[PDB]
Design a protein around this ligand. Structure first.
Ligand SMILES: CC(C)C[C@H](CNC(=O)CCCCN)Cc1ccc2c(c1C(=O)O)OCO2
Ligand SMILES: CC(C)C[C@H](CNC(=O)CCCCN)Cc1ccc2c(c1C(=O)O)OCO2
Ligand SMILES: [Cl-]
Ligand SMILES: [Cl-]
Lengths: 149, 149
């Protein structure tokens, strides 16, 4: 549970926003890329896994699941790759709504930055800091508890 | 204390590695850029601050301290910008040695990746996971304790 993340890819301004969500907390990391490739996804996972203890990733589609580069990165980082098929239905609708909510925040900050990538990082900030505890607080508490086990 | 980070810039393969160290834990985040500019530093801080609760940053040099873009990003993200002058001497030598240690790990993984940026992320992974607790475990414990205050 503390180690489970879900990949999510959404589109804005002709570009792609790649998102990783920590399922138990709602905490996100995100980046802008020109298009979703196995190489970009693999690199994104390597960054994620050096920053948080990533045990399991629910991949966002079959092409990334199949990607030899994604597989290599998951092997390297000790990540168990899984399908993002809604084996659990509470995720797929929450993702749709997360994308909507993230895009809403992006629109709210968009005029404060020249580049989309900057607006996306501002939106990540706002998302992770917003008190319901915040997602940032929740992920830390979840993982801290897990270290004592 | 839980919110204090230090910026560090080091060189390898004709490129620049920008590093943020969580002082109390030794946890790092890092990125490769062609050269250190205020714009790159500002963007790096925006990413950092959306991921961890950054209260204070000891900037790595005077040009970044002065940078209007760095100042803007620190204002936006609620970061108190400080000089990285060794007001405390336990940092400057530990940074020199951290750069040496990071470069050592980079050399150990370098042949496993085509691009330097990838090797740097692998090195971040190894650094943050290495059990002394690991830096990754320490930062989480430090921040979790601070949330209860
Ligand atoms: C996850 C890693 C083990 C491999 C993985 C794939 N690279 C190779 O197979 C090339 C090996 C070069 C041998 N000299 C590394 C990697 C992943 C994602 C990337 C990469 C790289 C890379 O630098 O090779 O560049 C940017 O996006
Ligand atoms: C920290 C932010 C408030 C500002 C900050 C500077 N940008 C501006 O002043 C332009 C304002 C555009 C108004 N339409 C945003 C920023 C920081 C660092 C960057 C940036 C940007 C940006 O996208 O403007 O691009 C990549 O590196
Ligand atoms: Cl970690
Ligand atoms: Cl945070």
């Amino acid at each position: 549970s503390p180690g489970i993340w879900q990949l999510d890819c959404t589109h804005l301004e002709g570009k792609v926003i790649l998102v990783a969500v920590h399922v138990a907390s709602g905490y996100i990391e995100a980046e802008v890329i020109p298009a979703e490739t196995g190489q970009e996804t693999a690199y994104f996972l390597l960054k994620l896994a050096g920053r948080w203890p990533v045990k399991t990733v629910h991949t966002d589609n079959g092409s990334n699941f199949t990607s030899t580069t994604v597989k290599a990165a998951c092997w390297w980082a000790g990540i168990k790759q899984e399908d993002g098929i809604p084996y659990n239905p509470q995720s797929q609708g929450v993702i749709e709504s997360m994308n909507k909510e993230l895009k809403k925040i992006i629109g709210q900050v968009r005029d404060q930055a020249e580049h989309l990538k900057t607006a996306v990082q501002m939106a990540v900030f706002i998302h992770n800091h917003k008190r319901k505890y915040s997602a940032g607080e929740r992920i830390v508490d979840i993982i801290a508890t897990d270290i004592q086990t």
